[PDB]
Structure 1
Amino acid sequence: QAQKEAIYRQLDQTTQRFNVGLVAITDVQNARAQYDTVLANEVTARNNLD
């Protein structure tokens, strides 16, 4: 859960940077991929507890 919060904040920061315009679209795609990976990891951990 802590990792998910941190990764979501990082993704939001990257999206803000792109919207203002500081980084290319590849960084945004990479951040979104990392966020999706973290979501899958959270689902796996929940199922492990169950």
Structure 2
Amino acid sequence: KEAIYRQLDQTTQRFNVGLVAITDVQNARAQYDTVLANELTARNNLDNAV
């Protein structure tokens, strides 16, 4: 999650600068959103195991 967040920040910063399009930011946001679901699932699995 840390890595993906760092990547999203870079992509957003570049788009604002004017080097990429909106589609790249949308893809970065999708990738960042996916890891948020995975992180939540891991905690649920840990609690279920306990």
> Which blocks of at least 5 consecutive residues in structure 1 are unaligned?
none
Show CA shifts across 1:1-49 (max 9, x none). Answer: xxx0000000000000000010010000000000000000000011111
Give the whole-Å Cα distance in 1 for the aligned partners of 2:46 and 2:14: 37
> Which blocks of at least 5 consecutive residues in structure 2 are unaligned?
none
What TM-score, normalized to structure 1? 0.91
The alignment covers a number of residue pairs equal to 47
Give the whole-Å Cα distance in 1 for the aligned partners of 2:26 and 2:41: 23
Runs of 4+ in 1 over 3 A off after TM superposition: none
